[PDB]
Design goal:
The structure is a homodimer. With 105 residues, the first copy, chain A, is mainly α. Chain A is built from four helices and two strands; from the N terminus they run H-H-H-E-E-H. Chain A is elongated, with a radius of gyration of 17 Å. Chain B: GO terms for molecular function: metal ion binding. Chain B: Keywords: Metal-binding.
Chain lengths: 105, 101
């Protein structure tokens, strides 16, 4: 329901797609539609809006391939931030378990 | 990263209130203990978040010396369940993505 949370989910998925490898928008949508067994088919226009913010923040970069297609790549700024995230969100999952357990105590 | 820092802080607070109604200093203690001192929330940061959450019906407050108690509303429990599901769905989308690769 929280608008800000769907946008976060869509970023998390995308940054993983690019983590598995460099890709083009069409390839990205197919893979998300495939991996979500069809529930999630992102439209190209919202994607281009999202990748626009990411290059602006240096998380990914762009280039051309080979017909010929435009590919996106995860940079270190991205790889690192994606690592920083997993650790920070690991602490959160742990804080919660410590809460749940102290409730039993 | 602020957008992740405020989000993480919100998830924690709302989980404390799921454990039970509690007052601001009691919430900071629990968070400080559950993080073994890593995350020590300041009183003002809580009041800044609880005002946004109370405006949205996610929590409400009441009085019970005397302390101000915060409670997760039905909307909050509900939204928090809908959320944990929507966030669990992502985990599989990703595994299916990594798995398809």
């Amino acid at each position: 329901i929280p608008k800000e949370m769907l946008r976060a989910q869509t970023n998390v998925i995308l940054l993983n797609v690019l983590k598995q490898g460099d890709n083009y928008v069409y390839g990205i949508i197919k893979q998300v539609k495939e991996a979500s067994n069809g529930e999630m088919e992102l439209n190209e226009a919202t994607l281009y809006t999202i990748f626009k913010r990411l290059e602006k923040d240096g998380i990914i970069s762009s280039y051309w391939g080979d017909g010929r297609r435009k590919y996106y790549r995860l940079t270190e700024i991205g790889h690192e931030n994606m690592r920083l995230a997993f650790e920070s969100w690991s602490r959160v999952d742990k804080i919660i378990e410590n809460l749940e357990a102290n409730k039993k105590s």
